Design a protein around this ligand. Structure first.
Ligand SMILES: COC(=O)c1cc(=O)[nH]c(=O)n1[C@@H]1O[C@H](COP(=O)(O)O)[C@@H](O)[C@H]1O
Ligand SMILES: COC(=O)c1cc(=O)[nH]c(=O)n1[C@@H]1O[C@H](COP(=O)(O)O)[C@@H](O)[C@H]1O
Lengths: 215, 215
């Protein structure tokens, strides 16, 4: 990932999402697109971004259904041109395996979300997160998401998944996480509002990248 | 809900989804629309169904993000005309409260998904499900989803949420659940494939309704 920085593009307007992504494109190679943008502007936005920016697109869809429905969601998402999809591990191994099977069929990747970054993640997800990560390892998952807001948890996650797995991490900036600390454990950080709500997104992205290079 | 039967419309083609929904409309008053259809045909499909069929629409989006992103997903979903949205409880109370706040602002409803119907739900969700349900009660949630495939769990869920809360239940038919047993505890059943993959969906829906009336 260019500069170890992934843009979380959660603006809900195509014109604003295009403007900001264009302004910061020199500093990233990967955009995370989620439901705020796709449910406002349509799934065609994924191929439009891929074409316009030549970026990789991670569809942050948090897939969290039964296996049969997960299959359908993943097929529709890769048909729309996404490079990878983020999947919840909490629904269990059959639900994750269904997403892995569609990614294998379509030559795509699954990222497993293990422990979330917000305060409520402490209630139920955190207590299951090490097990969810070990389930990922046992299913052959190679890409994971874990929380910038809890670097001790992100260290434990890294310990479970090993040094060869790819780990990306949201919660940097607005939610309180720090780029440099997070990159002690994660390969890349996800940043949304700190960039896309900034008066100058390119300057916000450049400032983050300057602090990453120093690491 | 008319006849206590909610159609899970997970066909991925607008023409097929419209045909089947029209054929069974005399037997339901509520259609559950999820991501298989919306990610294939666009969010405009929700208002189209509401207009064409005069049904209520439950958006089965399994919302399962941090509070700020959940807000955005719910706003986009109610803007598209959905009557209600299904929300995961596993991400914790702040994530659920964010959805409740948007539903209160827009005069809509939240359904809390407590325990899922597929086999993998046993790994992590089932052990947290009673607590997730009690969290719902303490947040003021009045509408819940629980599993037809485990009627003893559906009885425990009902015990926690009380007799005044509304409880709907998927997993009937294809996943092995029974209409009559499920309706001992749930107010309505959700049925997808048993109807929409049938050679004659209207006959499939009518057969289910005949067995419901007998209860
Ligand atoms: C895999 O899903 C995520 O990206 C996600 C998981 C998580 O635990 N925390 C989290 O913040 N996210 C998402 O990452 C983005 C964070 O954006 P932010 O920098 O806080 O504006 C946003 O799109 C969230 O929906
Ligand atoms: C609230 O979300 C659901 O509807 C859901 C939760 C769950 O635990 N199990 C479950 O089957 N569902 C959904 O309900 C539908 C079941 O359809 P089916 O009758 O099995 O074809 C389908 O849309 C599933 O995604």
């Amino acid at each position: 990932v260019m500069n170890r920085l992934i843009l979380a593009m959660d603006l809900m307007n195509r014109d604003d999402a295009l403007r900001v992504t264009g302004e910061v494109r020199e500093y990233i190679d990967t955009v995370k697109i989620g439901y705020p943008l796709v449910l406002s502007e349509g799934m065609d936005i994924i191929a439009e971004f891929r074409k316009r920016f030549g970026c990789r697109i991670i569809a942050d869809f948090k897939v969290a259904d039964i296996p049969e429905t997960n299959e359908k969601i993943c097929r529709a998402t890769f048909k729309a041109g996404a490079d990878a999809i983020i999947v919840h591990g909490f629904p269990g191994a059959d639900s994750v395996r269904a997403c892995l099977n569609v990614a294998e069929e379509m030559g795509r990747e699954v990222f497993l979300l293990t422990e979330m970054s917000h305060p409520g993640a402490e209630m139920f997800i955190q207590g299951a997160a090490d097990e969810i990560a070990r389930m990922g390892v046992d299913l052959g998952v190679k890409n994971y998401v874990g929380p910038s807001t809890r670097p001790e948890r992100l260290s434990r996650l890294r310990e479970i998944i090993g040094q060869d797995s790819f780990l990306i991490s949201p919660g940097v900036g607005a939610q309180g996480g720090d780029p440099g600390e997070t990159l002690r454990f994660a390969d890349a950080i996800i940043v949304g509002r700190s960039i896309y709500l900034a008066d100058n997104p390119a300057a916000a992205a450049a400032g983050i990248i300057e602090s990453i290079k120093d690491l």
